[PDB]
Amino acid sequence: DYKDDDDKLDRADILYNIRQTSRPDVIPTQRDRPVAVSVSLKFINILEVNEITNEVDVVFWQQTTWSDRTLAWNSSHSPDQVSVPISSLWVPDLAAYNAISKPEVLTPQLARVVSDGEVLYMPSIRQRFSCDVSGVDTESGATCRIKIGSWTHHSREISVDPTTENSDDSEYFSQYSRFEILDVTQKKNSVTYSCCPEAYEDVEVSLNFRKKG
Amino acid sequence: DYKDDDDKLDRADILYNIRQTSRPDVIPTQRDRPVAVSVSLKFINILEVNEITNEVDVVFWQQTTWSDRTLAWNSSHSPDQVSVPISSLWVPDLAAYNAISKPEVLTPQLARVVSDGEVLYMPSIRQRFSCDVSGVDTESGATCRIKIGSWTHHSREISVDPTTENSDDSEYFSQYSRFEILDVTQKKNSVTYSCCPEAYEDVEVSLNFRKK
Amino acid sequence: DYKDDDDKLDRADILYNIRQTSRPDVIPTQRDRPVAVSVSLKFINILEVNEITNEVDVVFWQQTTWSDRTLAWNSSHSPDQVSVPISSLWVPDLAAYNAISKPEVLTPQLARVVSDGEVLYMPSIRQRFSCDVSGVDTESGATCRIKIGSWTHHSREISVDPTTENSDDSEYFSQYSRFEILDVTQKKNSVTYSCCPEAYEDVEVSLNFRKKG
Amino acid sequence: DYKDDDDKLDRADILYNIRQTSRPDVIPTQRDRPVAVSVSLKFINILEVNEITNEVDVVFWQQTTWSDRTLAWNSSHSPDQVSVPISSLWVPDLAAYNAISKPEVLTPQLARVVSDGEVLYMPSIRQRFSCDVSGVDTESGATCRIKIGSWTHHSREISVDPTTENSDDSEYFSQYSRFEILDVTQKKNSVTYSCCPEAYEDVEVSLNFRKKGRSEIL
Amino acid sequence: DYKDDDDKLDRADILYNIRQTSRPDVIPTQRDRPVAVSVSLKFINILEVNEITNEVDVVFWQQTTWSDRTLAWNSSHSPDQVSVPISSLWVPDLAAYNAISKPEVLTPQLARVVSDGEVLYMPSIRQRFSCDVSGVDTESGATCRIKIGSWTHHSREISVDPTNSDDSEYFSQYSRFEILDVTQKKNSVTYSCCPEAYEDVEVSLNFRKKGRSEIL
Numbered sequence A, C: 001d002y003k004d005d006d007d008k009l010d011r012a013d014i015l016y017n018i019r020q021t022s023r024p025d026v027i028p029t030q031r032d033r034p035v036a037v038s039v040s041l042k043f044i045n046i047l048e049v050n051e052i053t054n055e056v057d058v059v060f061w062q063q064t065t066w067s068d069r070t071l072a073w074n075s076s077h078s079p080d081q082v083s084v085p086i087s088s089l090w091v092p093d094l095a096a097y098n099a100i101s102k103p104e105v106l107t108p109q110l111a112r113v114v115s116d117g118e119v120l121y122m123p124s125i126r127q128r129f130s131c132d133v134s135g136v137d138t139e140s141g142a143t144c145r146i147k148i149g150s151w152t153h154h155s156r157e158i159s160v161d162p163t164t165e166n167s168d169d170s171e172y173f174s175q176y177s178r179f180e181i182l183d184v185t186q187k188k189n190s191v192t193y194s195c196c197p198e199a200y201e202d203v204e205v206s207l208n209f210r211k212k213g
Numbered sequence B: 001d002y003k004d005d006d007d008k009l010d011r012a013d014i015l016y017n018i019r020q021t022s023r024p025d026v027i028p029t030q031r032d033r034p035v036a037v038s039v040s041l042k043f044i045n046i047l048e049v050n051e052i053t054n055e056v057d058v059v060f061w062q063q064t065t066w067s068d069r070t071l072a073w074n075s076s077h078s079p080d081q082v083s084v085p086i087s088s089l090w091v092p093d094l095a096a097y098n099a100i101s102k103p104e105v106l107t108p109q110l111a112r113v114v115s116d117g118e119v120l121y122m123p124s125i126r127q128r129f130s131c132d133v134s135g136v137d138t139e140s141g142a143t144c145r146i147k148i149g150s151w152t153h154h155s156r157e158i159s160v161d162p163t164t165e166n167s168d169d170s171e172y173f174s175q176y177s178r179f180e181i182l183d184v185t186q187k188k189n190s191v192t193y194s195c196c197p198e199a200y201e202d203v204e205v206s207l208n209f210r211k212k
Numbered sequence D: 001d002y003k004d005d006d007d008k009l010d011r012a013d014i015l016y017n018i019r020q021t022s023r024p025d026v027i028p029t030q031r032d033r034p035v036a037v038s039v040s041l042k043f044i045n046i047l048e049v050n051e052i053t054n055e056v057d058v059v060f061w062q063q064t065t066w067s068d069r070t071l072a073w074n075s076s077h078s079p080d081q082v083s084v085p086i087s088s089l090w091v092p093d094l095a096a097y098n099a100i101s102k103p104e105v106l107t108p109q110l111a112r113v114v115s116d117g118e119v120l121y122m123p124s125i126r127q128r129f130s131c132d133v134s135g136v137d138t139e140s141g142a143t144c145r146i147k148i149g150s151w152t153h154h155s156r157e158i159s160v161d162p163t164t165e166n167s168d169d170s171e172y173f174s175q176y177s178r179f180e181i182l183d184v185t186q187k188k189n190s191v192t193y194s195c196c197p198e199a200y201e202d203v204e205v206s207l208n209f210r211k212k213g214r215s216e217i218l
Numbered sequence E: 001d002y003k004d005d006d007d008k009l010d011r012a013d014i015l016y017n018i019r020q021t022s023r024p025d026v027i028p029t030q031r032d033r034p035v036a037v038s039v040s041l042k043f044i045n046i047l048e049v050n051e052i053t054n055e056v057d058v059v060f061w062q063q064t065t066w067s068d069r070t071l072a073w074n075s076s077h078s079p080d081q082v083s084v085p086i087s088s089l090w091v092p093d094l095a096a097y098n099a100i101s102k103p104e105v106l107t108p109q110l111a112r113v114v115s116d117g118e119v120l121y122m123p124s125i126r127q128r129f130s131c132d133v134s135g136v137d138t139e140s141g142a143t144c145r146i147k148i149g150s151w152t153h154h155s156r157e158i159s160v161d162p163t164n165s166d167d168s169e170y171f172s173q174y175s176r177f178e179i180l181d182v183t184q185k186k187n188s189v190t191y192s193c194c195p196e197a198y199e200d201v202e203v204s205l206n207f208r209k210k211g212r213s214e215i216l
C-alpha cells in the first residue's frame, strides 16, 4: 500500500524478514527450474573509443531483475517495496565475457525488493570492452557487441534473458556525448566450450553507434 | 548546552544512545512523510575540463542535511552535538545521475548529530561528470548541470530540497583554479522512465563557469 | 544428478556441508601426497605490448582445478555441483613469478565444487608481465613466457601442473584483438634457489603470438 | 622503565589495558577543555608541480600528537611506550581543506602510546593540493599554502596547534628532489563560514619552495 | 619430519596452535632483547627511471625473517613448516623511508612458520622511490639507495639487519636495465625532535641502462 510507504517500523520489519529468509549464496530456484534473470543495458555514455585496438570505455545502467518468491510478503497494509543492501541478497554472478577492465560501480549497492518477491537491481557501471570499433567514423557506424552471462551457473541453473530486443536508449544516453547511438539490440545466445559439457546462457548486447558529425 | 559540550562521558553516552536507536539501513520517515533531504553543492575547484568530450572534473563540498527525530535527546545539561561515523547512521543513497567516475571522498566519513535529531553530513568529493562544456572559453561561460538524487528511493520515500544561498560561494571556491565561477543555482526536478512510473526527485545544480 | 540441480534446499545443504568441512587455510593433502593443482591459461586479450621495456598487458581466464575429497557428497539424488564463494574454500596460493602488476580479477570470485570433491576455479585476470616481446611484429612472432607456481608451498606440498601441452585458444581469444596466437604451450617446470633447500614445481606458459598483418 | 621495554607480557597487558579503556569514536576531552592536537608537516618530497593548473603533488610526514590521560599507566617497572594500531585509538579527524586527492598513507597505521597518555602518530602521506604555484621558477620561489584542521569538530572541541613555526626541514627533505625548500612556516588559523556558527581551528602550512637550477639556456 | 609434511590434520593442528599463541600486535621480544629482523631485497625488475625527477619504479622480493620461539613446536613426527596468513601473525612494521608510492604487494600474503619458531616472509613488492638516478645511462651506472626500517619501533625494540650480490638468480633477463651490484648495510637514523635511534637497512642498487648509445 502506497499510503504505508513511510511507516518506518513496517520498513524495518520487512528488512528483518528479508534478512531472515535470504540465502545470499544459494541460487533462488523455484519449482526445480532455472532462475530467470532479466538483463537490459541502458547506455549512458561512450567515453573513449579506439579503432586501432578495438576497445571502448562506456557507462551503462544494468537493469537487472529476477524473482525470489520466498522473500514475498503481504503488503496490503505495508510498503510494497524496500531498498536492501545487496550484501543481504543473492545477486546473479553476471560478468561480461569480453570485459577488459573491472566493472566500476558508480552507484549505491542497493536493490529494491518487491512484496511479490521480485528483486530490482540497477548498478551504474563504467567498464572497458574488447569489441568491433571499425566504422565508428562512418554513417552506418560501428557495432560493438558485449556478451553478459553468469560466470559459474549453466543454463539449467540460471537463464540470462534480454528484456527488450530493440531501442536507441533515448531516455538514457547523454546528449552531451561526442557519440550517438544508432541502435541497441539485445538477444539471447548460448555458449558451450569443448572442456565442459553444459551450456551457458547470455545476452548479446549489440551497440550500434557512431561519432557525431 | 554549550557549557557541557566537552563532558566526555556525556558524549560517549550520546553515541551509545544513537547507536542503539539508529537503523542505518532503514529510511528515517517521520509522520507519514518522505525524508526531506537538503542537498547543496559548494564548489571548491574545477580541475580539468574537456570541451571536445564534454567532461568536467570538480571538487565540491556536498552539504547534506536531514532529520531523524528518534535520535533526538534532551541537551539541557549535555552536549548539543556529537560527531558520529556514518557507518553508524542511515545516510541518503544519493548518486549523481550524470557522473562518469566514482565519487572520491576526500574527508573523514563522519556526520554531526544535533540534539534535535538533525544530521549534518558534508563530504568533500572529487568526481567527473558528463555535461555541457560548450562556451567555457567565452565570457558567458559554460553551464554544466549536475543532477543528484536518491538512487533507489522515489518521491514518496525521499524528497530533495535544493534550496540554498549562493552569495557565499566565494568563501568556498579556490582562488587558484584555472577557471572562475560566474554563478551556481539549484532547482528541484523529477525523473521518470517509460519502464518505471514512480517519480525520483533530484537537485539540478547548474554550474556556470569559464576559463580565466 | 542433473534433475535435482535446481533443488534449492539441497543446494543450501551442500553449501552448509562444504563450509562445515572446509579448512580454507590448510592444504588439502590427501594420503601423504602433494596437492595436484592443474593450471591452464586461456588467453582472451593481449591489450598492450611494449617493444622497448619487454612488457605485455594481457587478459586470461585461469582455468584451475584440484580435488579435496573431504568435500565430496552423494549426488545420486542431489545436485552434482554448486557455486561457492572462494572465501569459504582453500585455494592454491598461485602467483606469476614475472608479474609486474597485481592480478586484477574481473569476475565474481566463486568456484564450483563437484560432488566427487573436484574444485573448479577460473578467474578472468588482467595482469602485466615482464617477458620477451622481441619478434612480435614478425611472421614468427614473439614468445612470451609466464611462470606460475605456489608462492609458499614447495613440491612436497603442492604440484602446479599443466593440463594440455598445446592449445589453440580459439574458443577464447578475442577475434577483435590486433594480435593473434600461433601457439600456447604449457609445460612442467621445477625451480630451486641457492638460498633455500626445497624445489618449487611450476607451470611455464609460452605464449607465441604476433601482431596481425 | 627503559629496562622493562622488551617485557613481552607487559606490552601485551598494556595493549589490552589500552583497548579496554579506549573510546575510538569519542573525543578525549579532559576538564571540559578542547583536545589539543599538535600538527607539524615535515615535507619529504615534492613530486610534481603543475604551473598550468596550480597543483602540487607532495609527500610529507604528518607529526601529530595529543594526549588521553585515561590511557596512562604506571611505568615504574613496565614499558614506557608501545605501538598500537590506530583502529584501537581515537585519532583526530584531520583533513586538508585544499586537498584535491585522497591522502595516500605510505606507512603502517600504528601510533605510539606513551605511559603518560601521550599519543604520537606520524603517517607518511602523499597527496595533491590546489595552491599558489606561481614563482616556483624564481629565486624567491613559490609559496603553497596547505590548511589542515578537524573536519567535524569546532574550536571548543578540538584545537589544532602548530608545534613550531619555522624550519627548512633539512633532516627530512630528499636531496634528490628537483625542488628545494626555502622555508616551511606553520601558523594557527581560524575558519568560519557565514552559513554556520562556530569557528574551526586549523594549521596553515606555508611551503616556500623553488625549482633547482631555474636558469636555463632558453 | 618431512615424511609427515602432508599430514593434513597435523597441519590444521599446527595452524590452530600458532593462532592460539600468536599475538599479532605485540613485538615478539625474547629475553628482553630487541627483535632481530633480517631483510634482503632481491630485485626482479626496474620498470621506469626518471633522471629529471630522480625517481625509480621497481619490483623486488623482500626476503624477511625473524623468530618467535613461542610459536615453536616439536616436529619429531609432524610437519616442519606450514604456511600462515600474515593476518594471524606479528609482522614487523617495515617501511621504506624514501618511498613515494604505496608498496604494491603482488603475491599471496602468507608467511612460513618453521617448527623452531622462525618466520619467513617474502612479498613481491612494486614500489616507487626518490633516489639518485644520475649516471644510469653511463658505464658506472646509477646508485639508487633505499632505506628500510621499522616505522614505529626504535633500536631497543627492533633491529633491522642485512643478510653482496648482483641478484643473478632473480633479476629479469628481459629488463631494459641491468644490475651491476646490490649492497645492503646496517644503518642508524635519529632526529632532532626525538631521542631514540631507529635501525634500518640501506640498500644500494647500482644499475645501468642496457646497450647504451654513447659518444666515444
Ligand SMILES: Nc1nc(-c2ccsc2)cc(N(Cc2ccccn2)Cc2ccccn2)n1
Residues within 6 Å of the ligand: A063, A064, A065, A110, A111, A112, A120, A121, A122, A123, B150, B151, B152, B191, B193, B195, B196, B200
Ligand atoms: N530506469 C529504471 N529502471 C529500473 C529497472 C530496474 C530493473 S528493471 C528496470 C529501475 C529504475 N529505478 C528504480 C531503481 C530500482 C533499483 C535500483 C535502482 N533504481 C528508478 C531510478 C530512477 C533514477 C535513478 C535510479 N533509479 N529506473
Ligand SMILES: Nc1nc(-c2ccsc2)cc(N(Cc2ccccn2)Cc2ccccn2)n1
Residues within 6 Å of the ligand: B063, B064, B065, B110, B111, B112, B120, B121, B122, B123, D150, D151, D152, D191, D193, D195, D196, D200
Ligand atoms: N560550510 C559548512 N557547511 C556545513 C553544512 C553541513 C550541512 S549543511 C551545511 C557544515 C560545516 N561545518 C560542520 C560540519 C558538519 C559535518 C561535516 C563537516 N562539517 C564546519 C566545517 C568547517 C570546516 C571544515 C568542515 N566543516 N561547514
Ligand SMILES: Nc1nc(-c2ccsc2)cc(N(Cc2ccccn2)Cc2ccccn2)n1
Residues within 6 Å of the ligand: A097, A150, A151, A152, A191, A193, A195, A196, A200, C063, C064, C065, C110, C111, C112, C120, C121, C122, C123
Ligand atoms: N571454459 C570454461 N572452463 C572452465 C574450467 C574451469 C576449470 S577447468 C575448466 C569452466 C567454465 N565454466 C564453469 C566455471 C566454473 C568455475 C568458474 C568459472 N566458470 C563455464 C563458464 C562459461 C563462460 C564463462 C565462464 N565460465 N568454462
Ligand SMILES: Nc1nc(-c2ccsc2)cc(N(Cc2ccccn2)Cc2ccccn2)n1
Residues within 6 Å of the ligand: D063, D064, D065, D110, D111, D112, D120, D121, D122, D123, E150, E151, E152, E189, E191, E193, E194, E198
Ligand atoms: N621524526 C619523527 N617524529 C616523530 C614525531 C611524532 C609525533 S611528534 C614527532 C616521531 C618519530 N618517530 C617515532 C614514531 C612515532 C609514531 C609514528 C612513527 N614514528 C621515529 C621515527 C623514525 C623514522 C621513521 C619513523 N619514525 N620520528
Ligand SMILES: Nc1nc(-c2ccsc2)cc(N(Cc2ccccn2)Cc2ccccn2)n1
Residues within 6 Å of the ligand: C150, C151, C152, C191, C193, C195, C196, C200, E063, E064, E065, E110, E111, E112, E120, E121, E122, E123
Ligand atoms: N628465494 C626465496 N627466498 C626465501 C626467503 C625468505 C626469507 S629468507 C629467504 C624464500 C623463498 N621461498 C619460500 C617462501 C617463503 C615465504 C614466502 C614466499 N616464499 C620459495 C619461493 C620460491 C619461488 C617463489 C616464492 N617463494 N624463496
Ligand SMILES: *[C@@H]1O[C@H](CO)[C@@H](O)[C@H](O)[C@H]1NC(C)=O
Residues within 6 Å of the ligand: A074, A075, A076, A077
Ligand atoms: C493479505 O492480507 C489481507 C488482510 O489485510 C487479506 O485480505 C489477503 O487475503 C492477504 N493475502 C494473502 C495472499 O493471504
Ligand SMILES: *[C@@H]1O[C@H](CO)[C@@H](O)[C@H](O)[C@H]1NC(C)=O
Residues within 6 Å of the ligand: B074, B075, B076, B077
Ligand atoms: C530535560 O531535562 C531538564 C533537566 O535535566 C528538564 O528541566 C526538562 O524538563 C527536560 N525536558 C525538556 C523537554 O527540556
Ligand SMILES: *[C@@H]1O[C@H](CO)[C@@H](O)[C@H](O)[C@H]1NC(C)=O
Residues within 6 Å of the ligand: C074, C076, C077
Ligand atoms: C550413495 O547412494 C545412495 C544415495 O541415495 C545411498 O544408498 C548410498 O548409501 C550412498 N553412499 C554411497 C557411498 O554410495
Ligand SMILES: *[C@@H]1O[C@H](CO)[C@@H](O)[C@H](O)[C@H]1NC(C)=O
Residues within 6 Å of the ligand: D074, D075, D076, D077
Ligand atoms: C607505581 O608502582 C610502583 C610499584 O611498582 C610504586 O613504587 C609507585 O609508587 C607507583 N606509582 C604510581 C604513580 O602509582
Ligand SMILES: *[C@@H]1O[C@H](CO)[C@@H](O)[C@H](O)[C@H]1NC(C)=O
Residues within 6 Å of the ligand: E074, E075, E076, E077
Ligand atoms: C617430541 O616428541 C617426541 C615424540 O613425538 C618425544 O620423543 C620427544 O621427547 C619430544 N621432545 C623433543 C624435544 O623432541
